A paper describes a structure:
The 8-carbon sugar 3-deoxy-d-manno-oct-2-ulosonic acid (Kdo) is a conserved structural element of the lipopolysaccharide (LPS) of Gram-negative bacteria. Prior to its linkage to the lipid A moiety by the Kdo transferase (WaaA), CMP-Kdo synthetase (CKS, EC 2.7.7.38) activates Kdo using CTP in a Mg2+-dependent reaction that results in the formation of CMP-Kdo and pyrophosphate. Crystal structures of LCKS and KCKS from E. coli as well as of LCKS from Haemophilus influenze (HI-LCKS) have been reported, displaying either no or one magnesium ion in the active site. These structures show that CTP binds to a nucleotide-binding fold located in the N-terminal domain of the enzyme, whereas parts of the C-terminal domain are involved in Kdo binding and the formation of the homodimer interface. In the present study, we describe the enzymatic properties, the crystallization, and the X-ray crystal structure of LCKS from the hyperthermophilic organism Aquifex aeolicus (AA-LCKS) in complex with CTP at 2.10 Å resolution and show for the first time that two Mg2+ ions are present in the active site of the enzyme.
The asymmetric unit (AU) of the AA-LCKS-CTP crystal structure contains three molecules arranged into one-and-a-half homodimers. Each polypeptide chain folds into a U-shaped molecule with a central, predominantly parallel, β-sheet surrounded by α-helices. The two arms of the U-shaped molecule are formed by the N- (residues 2–91 and 220–234) and C-terminal (residues 100–210) domain, respectively, the latter being responsible for homodimer formation and Kdo binding. Compared to the previously determined ternary EC-LCKS-CTP-2β-deoxy-Kdo crystal structure, AA-LCKS adopts a more open conformation with a larger groove between the two domains. R10, T14, R15, and K19 of the CTP loop bind to the nucleotide's triphosphate group, which adopts a staggered conformation and harbors a Mg2+ ion (Mg-B) with octahedral coordination geometry. In the AA-LCKS-CTP crystal structure, an additional Mg2+ ion (Mg-A) is present between the strictly conserved side chains of D219 and D95. The octahedral coordination geometry in this case is completed by interactions with the CTP α-phosphate group and surrounding water molecules. Furthermore, only Mg-A is connected to the protein via D95 and D219, while Mg-B interacts exclusively with the triphosphate moiety of the CTP and additional water molecules. The crystal structure of AA-LCKS provides the first direct structural evidence that two Mg2+ ions are recruited to the active site, strongly supporting the two-metal-ion scenario. Moreover, the structure demonstrates clearly that Mg-A binding does not depend on the presence of the regular Kdo substrate, as was suggested for EC-LCKS.
Author numbering:
A (entry chain A): 2 to 232
B (entry chain B): 2 to 234
Write the structure that this text describes.
């Protein structure tokens, strides 16, 4: 009763036609799908192009969805409504690194009784970059807050923080539908961070610390960088 | 019953002997005490200093405390721990502004069943100053996080944020005791923010938004700021 859903639209703006961009001779979306199928889970691509569907068709289910859906999570919400499932992972279509254990860790955490779980890695590079999301945690590993600002403020030094949030999320289905029904919240819209809707509405997010390398492909520089890593 | 407890040790470092520092002809601590006494509440000064005691002894109770207590909240706990009260307000000794209705709002909030209550005000100037504490709230007004960093990040601007935290706290006695028994936590020590111990240990902090002006006196600059405000009411 599990699925990994991947939203991957064709109309990326910072890189032309992202899902189809070749990484070491293989389209980005195929890297993501290959890695996710190897985990043995049910994998569902949500896309708005048959050209993208045709690249991974052989490996997983694809569902076409309106191009004009305004976010990755709206695209996932749009396929999840019609899917009879209990536990969902939402995976970024531009994240070619996939680790079976993290997928497993996420699903186990949900089976323990968590409604929302996500990932974070120790990373100093992200600290002062507004495009990277930082996260701070309570003693049991629940997120206190996520921000584009450099959090925490280092009045004293530390080797654990700062953390970079990795935008992969596990949900219980009903919590994900609940999220879809809540109006956008105040800090969510200020920061441009959908995950704040959960926090602002008192939904706990379990954050798991991973050492595995993640790094999305948004720009031509990311593609060059992530190309080198995949060796 | 309830009490308001004011920790004021003599040994400030960023400004010398600050409770005794002259503020428009009155020592700083005397402003705080005079303000609090007109609330009608029981007001207690917690201090390590005979000179500090002498300046307010005519107005309120003074309790002696060890000079080596490591923070104001710890000085408050030192007297609270064998005081027969249910609810307390920890009011900073270097906060010369007092608003009776704010004191009442805090106590009412504790009477609803809150364990920890504090205040924040809209303040654009505090945003980029590390010495000032920003706070972000959930939809019910509970603190999500406090930080010296500029939070929230303004991908878009806002009418409400940013907020400056005003370091006045209401506690149920038992909650103040638990806090004192918790070891300093990780983000607390990174940020230099004791209140984070509460969040990291999963104790909810209710934050009420006040429109009243507050400003702590930590440096000579703060003292001038405060003097200018007080000459312009
Ligand atoms: N309207 C949107 C926007 C994003 N996504 C998906 O959400 C993920 C994260 O978004 P992002 O990395 O920003 O990709 P793009 O929006 O496509 O790229 P860009 O921001 O450069 O335009 C991507 O896999 C993307 O395909 C989507 O399905 N629908
Ligand atoms: N060990 C401490 C530290 C602080 N306080 C009290 O807590 C309040 C807030 O502390 P702060 O503004 O930092 O004053 P000081 O620590 O005394 O001064 P400084 O930090 O400049 O050395 C003050 O009323 C102060 O007297 C206290 O009782 N004992
Ligand atoms: Mg985008
Ligand atoms: Mg991306
Ligand atoms: Mg101090
Ligand atoms: Mg102060």
């Amino acid at each position: 009763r599990r699925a990994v859903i991947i939203p991957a639209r064709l109309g990326s703006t910072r890189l032309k036609e992202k899902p189809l961009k070749n990484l070491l001779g293989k389209p980005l979306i195929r890297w993501v799908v290959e890695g996710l199928v190897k985990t043995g889970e049910r994998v569902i691509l949500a896309t708005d192009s048959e050209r993208v569907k045709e690249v991974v068709e052989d490996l997983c289910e694809v569902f076409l969805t309106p191009s004009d859906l305004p976010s990755g999570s709206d695209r996932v919400l749009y396929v999840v409504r019609d899917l009879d499932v209990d536990l969902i992972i939402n995976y970024q279509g531009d994240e070619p690194f996939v680790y079976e254990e993290d997928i497993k860790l996420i699903f186990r955490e949900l089976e323990k009784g968590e409604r929302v779980v996500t990932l974070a890695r120790k990373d100093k590079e992200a600290y002062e970059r507004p495009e990277d999301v930082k996260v701070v945690l309570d003693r049991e590993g629940y997120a206190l807050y996520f921000s584009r600002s450099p959090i925490p403020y280092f009045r004293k030094n530390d080797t654990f923080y700062p953390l970079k949030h990795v935008g992969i999320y596990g949900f219980r289905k009903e919590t994900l539908m609940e999220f879809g029904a809540m109006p956008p919240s105040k800090l969510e819209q200020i920061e441009g961070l959908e995950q704040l809707r959960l926090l602002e509405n008192g939904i706990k997010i379990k954050v798991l610390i991973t050492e595995n390398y993640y790094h999305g492909v948004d720009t031509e520089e990311d593609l060059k960088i992530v190309e080198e890593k995949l060796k």
